[PDB]
Subunit: 204 residues, 2 copies
């Protein structure tokens, strides 16, 4: 068996989050966009309590069972998620939160609360999901998405949202199978860089 | 002259936020979606500090000047925005935060922090902008969007994002004129309602 657990990230997890983000960039051939630092993550991701702002779930795996609970979780509204699944890991030493324990970080989901004005109810928006080698092709991306959905239900949140590439027909079918809807009318707009900085000059 | 100011909302503003959301629903012919309550807004919108989670800027107007500052703002990183502009308001009494003062709430912008993993930097996502009658056709929607952009710059945030209808050609041109980019490849996915609730049954 391979045991898996999904838990909340805390500040000590910053090195793993950093390295997972980097591996995601490498995977996507987008490393030219990577400027993330451990200091940056540490100073930005943990300014609020879980589920109140940026939240990260970490997927960990082990050849032996996980404990049934986490007593030190940074939210009273979270208990971990688990699955048992029926592999060489050269990066294991970079992904072990307790060097002596037989547990490694395998992936993450970064999400934050969004809001429906009409319902006066928060939801979650999923920004990134990434599962590192050698744990790909095992359904763990799905597991991470499912964890966010389940957390929303437990907390009475009204929606979980994310984006998908228009040509990602397999993912679109998968999302539809889950009962999600693809909203065909909307397009994302982004203001960044020098165009964003120019707003400093606007006299209000 | 008509003077305008954009400030941070606080919990006492809940009745105005409620009524603006309702007017937005009426405007859009989407009142069948409205289930917002003052209690709902009050218990959800103010669990964190401004800019750490859900944040609302309120647009107010007056025939006389506003004070130059707000000394009680709920964030040390915010000073209000102002403009002077060169009108019957039958709903004024429902929109006056100090009944005796000659100031009324005219509109709002509801936004929250999003995140760029690759930069380890927060941004803002704008969920809603609404300007009520009789203050439409005066550029105040733009002013509200500009306020969010300017706030992002002052705080060193990396991006401001929002969505636009694909057929809203005038707004798309306006966003492009501001230096924003429309990201043609992405589609929003939404999991809600019974489809979301079904995740309670998933055994992890």
């Amino acid at each position: 068996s391979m045991f898996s657990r999904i838990r909340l990230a805390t500040p000590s997890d910053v090195p793993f989050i950093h390295k997972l983000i980097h591996q995601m960039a490498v995977f996507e051939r987008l490393t030219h966009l990577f400027s993330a630092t451990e200091s940056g993550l540490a100073s930005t991701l943990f300014t609020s309590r879980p589920f109140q702002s940026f939240t990260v779930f970490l997927l960990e795996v082990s050849r032996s069972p996980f404990p049934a609970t986490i007593t030190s979780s940074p939210s009273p509204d979270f208990t971990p998620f688990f699955k048992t699944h029926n592999i060489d890991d050269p990066e294991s030493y970079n992904f072990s939160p307790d060097m002596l324990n037989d547990v490694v970080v395998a992936g993450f989901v970064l999400f934050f609360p969004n809001y429906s004005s009409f319902l006066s109810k928060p939801g979650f928006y999923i920004e990134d999901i990434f599962v590192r080698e050698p744990y790909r092709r095992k359904g763990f991306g799905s597991m991470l998405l499912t964890a966010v959905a389940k957390q929303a239900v437990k907390m009475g949140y009204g929606r979980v949202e994310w984006v998908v590439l228009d040509w990602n027909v397999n993912a679109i079918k998968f999302y539809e199978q889950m009962g999600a809807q693809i909203l065909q009318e909307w397009r994302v707009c982004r203001l960044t860089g020098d165009a964003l900085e120019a707003f400093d000059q606007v006299n209000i």
